[PDB]
Symmetry: C2
């Protein structure tokens, strides 16, 4: 049936065309003459035609695709003035088998010419290029073509700092960093000097994109355990903090980029190396946690809690009080034992029990996450445990209650004592009905 | 200041007698700036939303403006603004008129407004949801962006009880009528809708009539194999969601029909299209069935004995050993596990599954030797080692019986130079999983593992 529908399409393209194209697409999601007929139609609803190509290409054996779309045809397609043909070329390139097949040609180079062309407004084409590059970048030869054969070009795009092509470059580097090893890492491509960061402030959108690039860069270093990359990034982190502080000379930085800078500083505080040496200097010289009242909640919600208790114990001790409002701060401050000890005297069963059930469940779920917080809950607030067990339609309440029940049960029967059987009973009722 | 002035220039350019030449470049620039986050409280945002609305409600299409660019500004502007301001421009009656129109861009804008409803139950007392369902299940609708906009609006609002009531109570006979059509296009959208909705449904809200299919409906779906495949996939994701969301109460509503899928899989003479076109999706379903919260594999052992007959069809053996619960495999097909499995790069998929149960691992243990593993290329050795590193019983086997393999994991000092993505990933994971066991259980391997892990992550 699928082969006959494709044969019809092959005869038809050489009315209700859109409907048959949809029918072909729907059947494929759930070959040379058809691919060649579509190619002739593209070299001469186009989105519906391309969707058939997008589903047909990965399904077929790549040798058959290569016969219709040669490396030479792909260069011609990408150098044309026909956007749908360029998208089809991208789909072919994306599905290259082996992934390094086109690594010896200038195909990747041409993909980069289109990607960094600010005049390109076709979002589907930009996405198709990025998807083709992301898929192929697991291969070493493809990363070599990108970061060695096209290094001067990438550095030229980087130096330009033209809004449209720069944002696409940042997106490209973010995607590429997940595949890059220590020996492949190039500072000139992935890292920005103080001078480039100062230049980005002139166009605040570019600056915000750069702050977000660094936040995701630090997050990826933590997620992928790529600590070797820290020495390449740390030296410029105090520049972002200096810009955050310098409201007289760079008012646009606090005016338009406060939130993204706070997320960056949250990541910087997770660098513990040499007793928070870098973050301590940024805080002392620039951030000055506690000195600007309107940022106190955010600092206590975002900054490494071990850092907060060691250098701003007075802020933690005095500022934090239990309420639905301070749940964000509770989740962060509870994540370090010493930091939790600095807020522990703000709790009582009475205070927690006065909160509406959704807020009690958010507080309880947070306290169930750690050994020291759960011990405090069980030994000092058994009335709160009584409220958790109880005598619910709200999805958030059910989510936090079930997570609290599950986190306590993870501790085991021995550590739960008298709470074991009531918790098991409540969890069974919630998951089994 | 800059973003609201960019929005101000757009409001002024759109209200000029004739649209200026730069209109589409301005819209595109507005979209890139809004991408960031929340709006400036400079002005109400109401005149710009109302100006865009007049362009969308107009039956006159202007050659000079790009409607996709105009909608992209709406899709970024609506969630950024206070909903009371959006309501002033787009009332519940304007939304009904927009959805009942013949203007697709206007219907998409209506969806964005509905999606961002605050409170979520605001339009639950109107027929707005009913109209969204009429469009969603209309086969003649070819606009994929409109279909997605409806699904996104329904997904966002379905966390609310009143919205689920409008869906599953006020529109129950309609939804059941769409379900009974089993017309390809509307059916696929219905399955996607039910998958979205199941995330939010509680035990007391669950309705068998709309979420579950009887044997008769499953037999009817075979007539159009695409519909049957969509149904197999629906059940696989349904069982996966029960495991992921701990919704075990739903199993009693689904289990009774699971043997029908296995019967169809076996019956190649009377249902040849089942095996011909749906083998792979059925294998994924059976993998989930072998993992359900049930009493000693009651249901799966009957499906296997009567229909699946694991081990009787040689060409499916690798797939069964890669997919089926390993505890089930060793208890009922120990002979298959013992004879079939041998170590190679090819059998890595089987190794990862069979290693996940201790008894099952004991049945493959004698196929390992340091010599066999050491002959594999380094990427494959790392995949094998990383698998053995995942469990207490496999790691004990690796450390006590294959110290030469541990020697290969530690290596000759050239690991810092490994460029292969996959090799680094599996080696580092193996190193990390072993270190998680602690210094006491690692003995002499502790310091070399710590040294190798430090070099990999810090060097």
């Amino acid at each position: 049936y699928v082969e006959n529908l494709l044969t019809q399409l092959e005869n038809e393209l050489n009315e209700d065309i859109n409907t048959l194209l949809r029918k072909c697409s729907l059947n494929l999601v759930t070959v040379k003459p058809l691919l060649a007929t579509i190619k002739r139609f593209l070299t001469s609803n186009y989105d519906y035609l391309l969707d058939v190509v997008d589903k047909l290409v990965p399904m077929a054996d790549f040798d058959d695709v290569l016969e219709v779309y040669s490396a030479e045809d792909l260069v011609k397609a990408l150098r044309s003035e026909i956007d749908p043909l360029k998208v089809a070329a991208c789909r072919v390139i994306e599905n290259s088998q082996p992934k390094g097949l086109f690594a010896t040609s200038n195909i990747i180079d041409i993909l980069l010419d289109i990607l960094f062309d600010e005049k390109v407004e076709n979002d589907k084409l930009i996405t198709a290029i990025e998807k083709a590059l992301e898929r192929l970048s697991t291969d070493e030869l493809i990363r070599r073509r990108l970061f060695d054969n096209n290094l001067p070009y990438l550095v030229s795009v980087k130096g330009r700092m033209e809004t449209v092509s720069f944002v696409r470059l940042i997106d490209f580097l973010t995607i590429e960093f997940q595949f890059i090893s220590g020996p492949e890492f190039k500072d000139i491509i992935f890292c920005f000097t103080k001078e480039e960061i100062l230049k980005s402030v002139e166009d605040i959108l570019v600056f915000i994109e750069l702050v977000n690039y660094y936040t995701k860069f630090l997050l990826e270093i933590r997620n992928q355990d790529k600590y070797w990359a820290l020495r390449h990034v740390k030296k410029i982190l105090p520049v972002f903090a200096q810009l955050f502080e310098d409201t007289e000379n760079y008012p646009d930085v606090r005016a338009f980029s406060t939130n993204c800078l706070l997320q960056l500083f949250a990541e910087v505080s997770r660098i513990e190396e040499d007793e928070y040496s870098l973050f301590k200097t940024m805080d002392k010289d620039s951030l000055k946690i506690g000195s600007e009242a309107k940022l106190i909640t955010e600092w206590l919600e975002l900054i490494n809690p071990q850092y907060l208790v060691k250098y701003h114990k007075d802020v933690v001790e005095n500022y934090f009080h239990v309420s639905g409002y301070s749940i964000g701060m509770l989740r962060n401050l509870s994540a370090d034992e010493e930091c939790f000890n600095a807020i522990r005297n703000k709790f009582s069963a009475e205070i927690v029990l006065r909160l509406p059930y959704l807020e009690q469940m958010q507080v309880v779920e947070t306290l169930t996450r750690y050994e020291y917080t759960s011990k405090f809950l069980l030994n000092e607030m058994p009335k709160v445990m009584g409220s958790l067990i109880g005598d619910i339609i709200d999805l958030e309440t059910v989510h936090y209650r079930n997570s609290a029940l599950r986190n306590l049960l993870d501790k085991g029967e021995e550590k739960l004592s008298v709470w074991y059987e009531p918790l098991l009973r409540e969890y069974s009722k919630a998951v089994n009905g």
